Amino acid sequence: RVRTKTVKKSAKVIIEKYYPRLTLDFETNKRVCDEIAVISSKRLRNKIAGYTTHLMKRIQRGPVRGISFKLQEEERERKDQYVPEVSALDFHQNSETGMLDIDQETKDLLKHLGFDSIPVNVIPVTQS
């Protein structure tokens, strides 16, 4: 009992083009599909309605890869501008003592570049 590509493509395109007007109930999708589509077979219409009602059962509980609908995309670009008030890299507020930790030859690198005024503490690292 495996559905072919014609149903797979028709179910995906109907779901993404017309998401909200049809719901998890199979009976409603049965009359929704044939009114807004031209299908030459009754059983094939049943094939589409039966598989298409299966998708919203799992979409209702978590999103699924490979399917995108109008409501779903708009959520992404509203959420993607999230930004805190204090930077994670910023440590003047994040760390109680502003001064941070580096290693010895990093301090030597700072000496070479001339940025001596940066307040840091050097700790040796070696296991051997």
Added chain:
Amino acid sequence: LGPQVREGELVFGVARIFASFNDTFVHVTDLSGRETICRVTGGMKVKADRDESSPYAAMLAAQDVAARCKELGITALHIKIRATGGNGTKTPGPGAQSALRALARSGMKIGRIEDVTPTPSDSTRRKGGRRGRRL
């Protein structure tokens, strides 16, 4: 008839199980090889040459060994299983484990498991030739 002993203590014997790929031997002595309490082999138990080394035949041979040694008074056993050894397979045969289980189930006591297969440091030439058994 048997050794006099208080009910609490139990007396020990030793069973030397020889399991090759053609036959199995169960032989029970008394912590030394001078005296043989009992010996039984698969051949008596089985009715056909093919099955003389079978686990079932080894189980049958172990049952009447336990029965025969029950009235002698011995109540616990040490076991020393060995394969063909020497130039042989050095892997115990199929009828090894069978008899051991039948000995445990029959009511006999067990202690000091051991393997006594003889291994050579450097052996003489072994039978077969330079090309081996070509079948």
Added chain:
Amino acid sequence: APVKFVKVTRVLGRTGSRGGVTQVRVEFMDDTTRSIIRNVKGPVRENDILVLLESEREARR
């Protein structure tokens, strides 16, 4: 002969050259702790009950 009653708890594939025999895990229904592996000739369901003449013998795998 002390015939014993055993019951099957799980079926593990179908073995044999011709698929007649099946290999199962049985339970002795007298010491619920004990369990061994046996072979059966006929159809077997879960919770079936079998009659065993001898229990010491064991099957392959």
Added chain:
Amino acid sequence: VLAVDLLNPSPASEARKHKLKTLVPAPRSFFMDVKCPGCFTITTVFSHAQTVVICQGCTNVLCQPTGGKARLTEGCSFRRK
């Protein structure tokens, strides 16, 4: 690579190459003067001496030959000359 100045290698790289693989070979052995605690004399000893070196006074051993550079006696001091 593809552009190197072979005439002026770094001193570290020439202290890093083999004694024969440099631009011009140069030995890495030296002489040294050892102060024997017993006496006040001075003796010049090769760093890689293959023979036991004896001091003029009190006839004491100063070094033991080995595969590489000779090992000095524990109770001795030296300066690189």
Added chain:
Amino acid sequence: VGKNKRLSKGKKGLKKKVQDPFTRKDWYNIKAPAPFAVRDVGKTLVNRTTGLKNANDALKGRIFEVCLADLQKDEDHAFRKIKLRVDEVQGKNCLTNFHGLDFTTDKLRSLVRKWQTLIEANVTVTTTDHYLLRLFAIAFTKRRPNQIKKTTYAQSSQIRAIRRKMVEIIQREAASCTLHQLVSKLIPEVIGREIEKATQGIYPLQNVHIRKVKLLKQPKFDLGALMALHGE
């Protein structure tokens, strides 16, 4: 199989009359020497004494294999088994003395491992009492906790150094001893700790052991010493 015999008893024979030879057997107890903890070690069987066939002669050349764990009542020495040889048989009481020592086969095979070095030696020695006995020794290379290199191999020149040091130590220890004193030295594994301590500088050498001991010659019977050790 019953039906394979062709000649059976042979050219010409007849069945037997008297059977069940166990009606004429006797049971004896076996004891252990002084240093060991438990003395009773089991029972033994033999034909009853009769004319022309004395019983005591048959109980003077028997040896028994007893694990040292049972004798010492301690499961740490569960991999060493020793032999006991009977010498004199007092009434319903067999007396025995030392006859050797040996590891079990499985412990020995479990120790030998790949990517290590195995060191082995042997030496004969005689005591103040004229007993000539031979000892074997074994050791293996030891890994270091911070080691990264896969294999731990020693150089053969170092190997000869360890073999010489072990032989010298074992000879020194067994130079002035008696059998009772020496046996009192095997059970606490005294030899190993000096072998490892002495060879510590050359190489770590974990798991130093004496593989086996066997005796070759014996002096006169000297019943006084046997009774000295027995019946304590």
Added chain:
Amino acid sequence: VKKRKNNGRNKKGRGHVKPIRCSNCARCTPKDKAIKRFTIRNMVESAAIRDISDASVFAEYTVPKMYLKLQYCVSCAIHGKIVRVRSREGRRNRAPPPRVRYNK
């Protein structure tokens, strides 16, 4: 043509090596050419472990181990299904197979 770069022997830097006897057909093959398998198993099978445990006289008991090292000729190697034919590209891969540690 070379089927294998190492001639299927693993021998470079020497001229000769003493042979051994096959453990199945008693054939002679060079030691470096033979297939070696080391096996560690228990003395008794897992169903019998308890039967030995409660039939012992030492309270808790630990069954000893058994150690063998078998070695076969190549003719017995793929008839006993120890190893099998690999593809042309898969031949040059000497990493030991990853044993299953979950068993479904």
Added chain:
RNA sequence: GGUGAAAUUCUUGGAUUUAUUGAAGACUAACAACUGCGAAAGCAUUCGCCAAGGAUGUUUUCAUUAAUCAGGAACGAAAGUUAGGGGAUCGAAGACGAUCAGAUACCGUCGUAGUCUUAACCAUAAACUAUGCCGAUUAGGGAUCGGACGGCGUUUAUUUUUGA
């Protein structure tokens, strides 16, 4: 006993099996590896004696003494040959038992030369890296055996320097 299954063969004139002791000859398991040495053939138990060798280290010494080689010469697995010693185990030839239409074979039980050593011949092998010897240059990597040099630590001893 042995085999896919059997037989030839040995056995109450006690076979097979168990323990103790003795003699003889051969061989050095596990450790043993994408590790070592030698011109190659080849070389694995301990220790003593004899001469030889590679690599590294060196502000020692001589100063072109060199490279490859027609003919020529030394060594040269296994098998084989000529005389002594030794002769456990395997086993060409040979004799039996099965299989098969046949089976002078593959399988099984015996078994001579041979397999070992001393003194001499033989000079051939898929003697293979199927890849001649000397010298120069050309790309990245990480392992590993021997010697030397530098370094932070751990371990440990009549302990430091050494060894790991």
